[PDB]
């Protein structure tokens, strides 16, 4: 749809995915990696994949954003926007309004960043006007929630932003470094023996092909603490073992060669070597467990850096940043919960989120929403920006113009 | 408001030649009547303005092919070319029927088959041109892929592999919707065979290679294969009439193309987010194009897809297991968590196999669908109010 | 006849609810009104409120008809 008789160019730069499109269509024109190749520049997946498989020397892969979710290379970002405009969108930057997303943060680099975007947008690309949207706020407002608790899990990590009455709590913003990128590492490292000082293109190809398949298929999230869960099933199995042995004690017999969900195996085909990879369900549970319990991987990391305590930490901090009562802020945050990001698509993640959050907050009743359309959840930030772009009046958001940029 | 099906105009511009049809018979299935080259002659003048002609008469001339690799390289030439066609059909009927303007040409709805690569800008211009310059009151801009699937009854999910001369399009469709972010195109096509054959037959003439490619002895054979596949040497007659003796190279040249297609289709469908949707797409594959008419091509491509992309227990592992199972005197099948479990070609229900055929079939059903209950396509009522921006009305 | 002659005569038909006016549009800048005016200009389709080329020869359909 065309609001105010016009269309907008919506762009979202994330750690992993970069989504660009028009505000009228409702589906994104393109989704490309948030990384790039240095030869010349190669910005497409298909374009990148070829360069990687081409296996040229002096080829490199660089992130386009710092772990904080902000762009750390502007000239590189400039080449991307040109590609987005010239290749995928096929429109001049001078023509249309630009709605882009930047992540929520506790600090105010925004003015440094805005000045950086002023140059990129205006003197560089001659963009007529543009708006910036806070991604969790975008996601929340788009969903009908004026106040919500947004858990965003992605390549960089878990980003938990509390929102009250339409504005973010800056102090209560928390960012884990555990997420899709961390999970990529563990899948590779753990499976290296089974497969039978690396080109960045080779690392990126593996991460974007067979590893991504592993996480979207093999990986699951326990509904409970894994140790606690494992001890339960073991003892439940011990009873079945003792039960079955006892029936042989009564009438006797000998060796008839006589139930634990954690031992069932999941089979993942590794096509490059055309060899099957097999892991029991417990080994699949293990990877995601590290997000809630990072201490297991290293001991360098504290239990509180885990997702479970962090969500609670954010909720507590949300109360302190408003000064109704802080104790009651919990009621509004836990009542409205938004689970988004691609990494939250791992099976059983929603339950564990509820489980871990319910433990530390037994008194409050809660209800969580997680978008059940698989694609939408991955691009949800961009869709949030899209609704903001499609707002009925210009008065409903901040727009930046050549007026704002001057000597 | 009033409409007679003989008035409906369907245009399907392609990179080389445009297919056009005027009217629908209602007795039978509609087939393209007119096949026109897609080109226009442009004489530049001192004014800085441009003039386009049907023929150059050896003057400044040049030639503008408005469509390259299915994309639109010249929008101005394309509209004039479109105009050329529209005016041409108007005169033909005008001369044949005196009252034509009062009856058949009274209202002419235009249905334009579009391409996935066409930009919003291009589509907006085309809309403006049809209503303003051509003075047409009804327009349907239909993507070919959605038109193609429309012929297939109740086909929600599928992947169209459209092999053109200089390029091949990969168009994944999900929930009756073209996913544009996953659509791609490879600079590989029917001509890649010519380029491939020229490597293995340097002594041959470019004319002779093409003649070999279209000859009956040119086919792509499965691993499983007085019949042609069996003898080492066979022969064909060129358009010149001369015999050309060719060896094993007649069965070659399509491998490089088929692999690149397969590889691209692999990544494309691997990025489908919902596996259950993705599984359906893999179960419906549409291989269409001119090149696909080559014998064994569809089978070779399908086979290559199953070769690399199919998820199934490796025969090497499965063999050891069956061998190890005995170990006895005098085996369970492996289950995988990935996609797909099975790969097969789209079934054509109730039907003839070409791309041009199915699109037009779809275009016919759409016309039945739109005109019965319109409330996609643009009407003069909207274009007057919204303008070329009327092209986008959704949500 | 002439192409414009063929275009102008064609597609002209009158029914109930049929628009008399043919509106024409242009792709140009626009300066949004305040709801004073906002200080930026963007490109969109605008309608000419006041109602304000190369025309070639027709073709022969049978030459380009099929066989
Ligand atoms: N189907 C899936 N199942 C599980 N994980 C997935 C799936 N698809 C992608 N991922 C993982 O999710 C991550 C991508 O996250 P996402 O696309 O949300 O990033 P982003 O939104 O661009 O960045 P951010 O989340 O920091 O804003 C990747 O690390 C990838 O491995």
Numbering used by the authors:
A (entry chain A): 0 to 38, 46 to 202, 214 to 275, 281 to 345, 379 to 462
B (entry chain B): 2 to 226, 274 to 378, 395 to 415, 421 to 444, 447 to 466
C (entry chain C): 1 to 35, 54 to 70, 76 to 90
Question: Which of the paper's sentences describe this entry?
Answer:
Chromatin-remodeling complexes (remodelers) are large, multisubunit complexes that regulate gene expression and genome maintenance. The HSA domain of Sth1, the catalytic subunit of the budding yeast SWI/SNF-family remodeler RSC (Remodeling the Structure of Chromatin), recruits Arp7 and Arp9. Arp7/9 regulates the nucleosome sliding, ejection, and ATPase activities of RSC in an Rtt102-dependent manner.
Here, we pre-incubated Rtt102-Arp7/9 with ATP prior to crystallization, and obtained crystals using polyethylene glycol 3350 as the main precipitant. The crystals, which diffracted to a relatively low resolution (3.25 Å), contain two copies of the Rtt102-Arp7/9 ternary complex in the P1 unit cell (RMSD = 0.51 Å for 833 equivalent Cα atoms). The conformation of Rtt102 is also very similar to that observed in the complex of Rtt102-Arp7/9-HSA, and, although the current structure reveals 13 more amino acids for this subunit, a large portion of Rtt102 (90 amino acids out of 157) remains unresolved in the electron density map. More importantly, unlike in previous structures, composite omit maps of the current structure clearly showed the presence of ATP in the nucleotide-binding cleft of Arp7 but not Arp9 in both complexes of the unit cell. A nucleotide-bound structure of Rtt102-Arp7/9 reveals that ATP binds only to Arp7, helping stabilize a closed conformation of Arp7 that potentiates binding of Rtt102-Arp7/9 to the HSA domain. In contrast, there is no cation associated with the nucleotide in the structure of Arp7. Indeed, Arp7 appears to lack a cation-binding site, as two of the residues that coordinate water molecules that hold the cation in place in actin, Asp-11 and Gln-137, have changed in Arp7 to His-11 and Glu-141, respectively. In summary, the biochemical and structural data presented here suggest that Rtt102 and ATP stabilize a conformation of Arp7/9 that potentiates binding to the HSA domain, which in turn releases intramolecular interactions between the pHSA domain and the P1 region of the ATPase domain.
